[PDB]
Amino acid sequence: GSMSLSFSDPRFDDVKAPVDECKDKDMTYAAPLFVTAEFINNNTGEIKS
Amino acid sequence: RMERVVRERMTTQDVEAITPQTLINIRPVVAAIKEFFGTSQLSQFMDQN
Amino acid sequence: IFKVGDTVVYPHHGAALVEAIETRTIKGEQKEYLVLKVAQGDLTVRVPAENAEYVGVRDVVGQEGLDKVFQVLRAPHTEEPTNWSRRYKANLEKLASGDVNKVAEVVRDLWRRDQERGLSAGEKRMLAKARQILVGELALAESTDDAKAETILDEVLAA
Amino acid sequence: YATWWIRQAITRAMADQARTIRIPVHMVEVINKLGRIQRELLQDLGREPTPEELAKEMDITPEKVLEIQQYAREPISLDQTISQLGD
RNA sequence: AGCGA
């Protein structure tokens, strides 16, 4: 219980390639996920975001 | 699954030296999504005749 | 200790820029947090000023430090336990400590070893990581351009 | 001393009796090193590295890396569900 | 895994 981890703010970027190009070149039509992580240490006290 | 790995190494890793970059593992998350979309009897093949 | 705009040093993440002295309260206590960002990890860290010295926030790398780790890098009369298992664990702990003198000792000992013999993949990675962190540390201690820092480091290794 | 002897014997027997095909110890070790390097680079970078990347990281040739990938292959099971592949 | 009789 001396340290903890948390998540917030799911966020996307634009897709890396368009629909027809993904269909042609056999790529999976996707986009990245970005999540703001946050580690905290209870005893000393910090945030690592 | 990610969480079990995270909490596992959350003790073994030395304190004052680690960060969510060193803590989080995205391999099982991406694997879970991929194993859902491929080879699941709900991720059905598009039936477009 | 450090006002705004200071290029304040912080382990293990090298130098960093203070952005503001945050007044983020907790349990009704307005701790004077300072937001502090590095360029490599692109992460922001908020630290209370009370225990900044307890977390070990570093400062402008003391000029003596350069010649100190140079002496360690030139430090002769160095030998290690015969069993490389013990040698490996010992200098791995030395690297884990992060102290500039100890890491300099590690890199110079392994430079002597790998100029003599040709050691191992694990050791090559050990030397690589220690060398990277040190060429960075000296490059921002003297503020002298990581590549040129590497050149001067190679110059001093030969002595 | 007991600990070290035990671990040596366990690792040796595991290697000799790991797969239906036998893969001697030194090649097992390089396979394990390649796997560890690839896994840690996946953790750090986030992407699966390239054969040339692993060749430069392990101070070996890309063709050697390809051969280690090849010998790393584990047999599939004739028994499965789809029915059995043996059909 | 999906489908026709």
Side-chain angles (χ1 to χ4, degrees), chain A, chain B, chain C, chain D residues 1-11 13-32 34-58 60-73 75-87:
Chain A
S2 66
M3 70 155 58
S4 65
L5 179 61
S6 175
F7 276 163
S8 171
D9 189 77
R11 185 175 58 257
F12 289 93
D13 193 44
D14 274 31
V15 296
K16 60 175 71 62
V19 172
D20 293 88
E21 189 164 359
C22 286
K23 194 177 285 181
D24 187 4
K25 303 173 173 181
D26 289 338
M27 321 175 48
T28 169
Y29 180 74
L33 268 190
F34 285 161
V35 168
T36 38
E38 181 184 3
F39 183 121
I40 297 162
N41 198 345
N42 295 322
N43 54 8
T44 175
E46 300 96 8
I47 69 164
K48 286 64 65 190
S49 294
Chain B
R1 314 302 267 288
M2 172 295 308
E3 183 294 308
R4 185 169 298 90
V5 165
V6 153
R7 149 182 316 130
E8 185 275 338
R9 60 179 63 186
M10 192 194 158
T11 64
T12 65
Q13 279 163 282
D14 159 40
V15 197
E16 290 99 8
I18 47 92
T19 187
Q21 216 71 21
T22 53
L23 195 41
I24 192 172
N25 202 352
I26 50 89
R27 184 159 61 86
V29 178
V30 64
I33 277 172
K34 200 49 49 168
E35 156 166 337
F36 173 71
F37 259 96
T39 81
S40 174
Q41 48 145 341
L42 280 65
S43 174
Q44 294 179 355
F45 220 73
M46 180 100 174
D47 165 285
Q48 47 179 4
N49 50 9
Chain C
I1 42 180
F2 324 122
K3 61 223 90 66
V4 79
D6 311 331
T7 69
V8 71
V9 186
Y10 178 71
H12 300 353
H13 316 281
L17 285 173
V18 286
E19 192 168 1
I21 300 96
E22 191 65 25
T23 64
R24 191 261 304 280
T25 184
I26 39 184
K27 77 174 93 62
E29 295 163 351
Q30 288 75 21
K31 267 84 166 179
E32 296 304 321
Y33 277 96
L34 57 103
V35 47
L36 181 52
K37 153 266 184 163
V38 310
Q40 168 269 337
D42 313 278
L43 69 148
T44 68
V45 182
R46 271 77 170 282
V47 200
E50 310 92 315
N51 52 5
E53 304 88 332
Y54 281 112
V55 52
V57 62
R58 273 295 318 290
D59 293 28
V60 54
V61 179
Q63 172 54 243
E64 96 286 26
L66 200 183
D67 285 292
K68 281 309 311 181
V69 295
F70 266 15
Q71 147 275 307
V72 172
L73 191 136
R74 275 188 319 238
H77 195 59
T78 326
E79 66 96 27
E80 292 289 321
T82 65
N83 264 273
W84 175 33
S85 295
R86 262 272 290 282
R87 170 186 298 116
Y88 164 99
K89 104 163 54 175
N91 37 39
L92 183 62
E93 180 56 59
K94 290 213 91 211
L95 153 62
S97 69
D99 180 72
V100 196
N101 302 290
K102 304 186 156 202
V103 306
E105 197 282 337
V106 166
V107 298
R108 74 106 165 70
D109 198 1
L110 278 299
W111 180 250
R112 293 177 184 179
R113 283 194 67 199
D114 72 349
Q115 66 74 24
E116 193 282 298
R117 178 68 62 84
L119 263 59
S120 169
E123 162 262 1
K124 276 185 306 280
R125 165 221 57 71
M126 223 180 150
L127 178 140
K129 181 182 174 181
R131 176 190 287 277
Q132 195 276 128
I133 181 159
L134 286 190
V135 299
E137 201 271 319
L138 270 285
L140 44 63
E142 295 75 55
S143 69
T144 179
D145 292 334
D146 301 327
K148 327 311 175 239
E150 198 253 353
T151 74
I152 178 54
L153 190 136
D154 296 333
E155 186 271 327
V156 284
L157 279 169
Chain D
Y1 183 54
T3 299
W4 276 118
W5 251 114
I6 297 159
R7 170 174 304 110
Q8 173 264 3
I10 303 147
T11 57
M14 189 301 304
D16 172 59
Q17 311 184 334
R19 296 306 304 120
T20 300
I21 324 296
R22 77 183 311 217
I23 292 309
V25 196
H26 57 280
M27 51 205 78
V28 166
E29 298 330 288
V30 54
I31 283 167
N32 290 318
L34 191 137
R36 185 174 293 172
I37 285 299
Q38 197 264 331
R39 232 162 287 95
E40 193 140 281
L41 289 177
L42 189 57
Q43 265 88 66
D44 156 72
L45 174 63
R47 331 179 283 98
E48 283 187 355
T50 66
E52 63 279 2
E53 194 283 335
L54 297 170
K56 74 152 171 303
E57 184 62 33
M58 290 186 76
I60 52 175
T61 67
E63 303 91 21
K64 176 140 180 290
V65 174
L66 163 61
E67 288 183 355
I68 310 328
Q69 304 290 355
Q70 174 51 62
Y71 286 171
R73 289 301 184 185
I76 202 181
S77 172
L78 274 181
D79 189 1
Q80 85 201 359
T81 166
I82 182 179
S83 304
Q84 296 81 1
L85 192 32
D87 185 1

